[PDB]
Amino acid sequence: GIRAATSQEINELTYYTTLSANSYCRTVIPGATWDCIHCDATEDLKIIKTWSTLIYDTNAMVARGDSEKTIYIVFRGSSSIRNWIADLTFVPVSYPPVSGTKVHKGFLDSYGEVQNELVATVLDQFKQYPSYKVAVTGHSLGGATVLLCALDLYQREEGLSSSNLFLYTQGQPRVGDPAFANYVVSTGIPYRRTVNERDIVPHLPPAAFGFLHAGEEYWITDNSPETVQVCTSDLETSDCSNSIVPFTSVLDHLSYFGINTGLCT
């Protein structure tokens, strides 16, 4: 099906796009403070911890919202996005937890570098607030790591399942082949994949290389008034953003809902 997103659904996706946008501020990661212009939206969240890894430069954080009863996981995209786009090269490798599936090596190496410590900090918080929900979000590169993070959490089968684990991504590139996308749909995890108009990143690598997207597609088709088309299928369809290919845009990547995503502007 194809349907229009509700007011409430746009409000929720703008909230996750803000957390994503905020993560590109050096005072947020690794500063560990809510000292930024749009931080006022999330400033009531308690920042548990932040990371800026050494080899892959993986920037992420764990935050806790008590009034929201949510444990938040946020992944930053690249600190030099134009360049990240211009140079992305895909290197399909086996995804270890699931035999018969392939993922781009570079996303596994990014996650791989923060995994241990991050997952221990999230289980520690979840053991203390078991009633809360776990929400993962990230834009661009951050969206690919966010997806690998949510699968890892579900796979630890620690009380995190489709009913209390949510993934929200903005401008995310495809991460694995068809077989890996099927696997993602098989977990049942609520996955909202947001695409901002003609943003070229959600169309990389080219359709021709063999990768495919999982997650319900929320496509921003207009910004004033904000309009979003939802392709409810959990696998990639030709009915939302793929309909504009190959006439994509690099600048559409840098703004979601009106928020600069990538420059903490």
The catalytic residue among 234, 241, 253, 255 is: 253
Q: Exposed e or buried b for every residue in 232-253, given b needs 16+ CB within 10 A?
A: ebbbbbeebbbebeeebeeebb
140 is catalytic: yes
The catalytic residue among 177, 199, 234, 241 is: 199
Distance (Å) of CA 242 to CA 52, 132, 207, 238, 248 = 33, 35, 9, 5, 10
The answer on whether 252 is annotated among ligand-binding residues is: yes
253 is catalytic: yes
CA distance 152 to 198: 30
Give backbone dihedrals phi and psi of 239, rounded to 5 degrees, phi first.
Answer: -95, -10
Q: Are 219 and 4 in contact (CB under 8 A)?
A: no
The catalytic residue among 140, 203, 213, 255 is: 140
213 is catalytic: no
Annotated binding site for Ca(2+), which residues? Answer: 252
Catalytic residue positions? 140, 199, 253
Annotated binding site: 252
